[PDB]
Amino acid sequence: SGAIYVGNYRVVNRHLATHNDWANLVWEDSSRDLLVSSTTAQGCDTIARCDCQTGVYYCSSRRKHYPVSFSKPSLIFVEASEYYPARYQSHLMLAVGHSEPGDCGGILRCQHGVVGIVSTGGNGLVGFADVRDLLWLDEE
Numbered sequence: 058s059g060a061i062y063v064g065n066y067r068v069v070n071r072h073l074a075t076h077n078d079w080a081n082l083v084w085e086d087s088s089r090d091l092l093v094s095s096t097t098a099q100g101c102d103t104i105a106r107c108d109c110q111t112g113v114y115y116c117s118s119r120r121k122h123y124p125v126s127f128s129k130p131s132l133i134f135v136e137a138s139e140y141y142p143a144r145y146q147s148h149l150m151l152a153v154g155h156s157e158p159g160d161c162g163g164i165l166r167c168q169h170g171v172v173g174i175v176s177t178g179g180n181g182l183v184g185f186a187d188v189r190d191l192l193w194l195d196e197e
């Protein structure tokens with residue numbers, strides 16, 4: 058689990074979105090595994106605006122933050138998990154590292170802020186859903 062709280066936005070994995078999230082929907086995209094809902098309270102997470110390929114992510118299944126190198130956001134074939142079939146996922150970045158389904162929502166951060174959240178796992182890779190292209194999270 059986990060989320061990003063920026064301005065009056067909550068960013069979660071689409072597959073973990075709650076009724077309240079859908080009842081306050083701003084934007085969602087299945088192909089990216091992202092959903093954004095509106096919040097009453099102001100959040101303070103800063104979204105990275107950059108092309109960094111190094112950062113640190115939180116892995117709940119190890120109670121650890123790991124420094125990683127990661128690929129640029131791309132359309133990648135993802136093998137079946139507990140929560141999605143085998144399919145193409147867009148805006149996905151991969152690193153060498155540990156990721157189990159419960160790790161989804163863990164933040165990847167660089168020197169500029171939040172890069173994305175854990176979305177995929179398996180075969181010794183961890184996949185992150187990028188948010189750095191979502192420039193509207195910073196406004197309204």
Ligand SMILES: [Zn+2]
Pocket residue numbers: 105106107108109167168169170
């Ligand atoms: Zn950065």
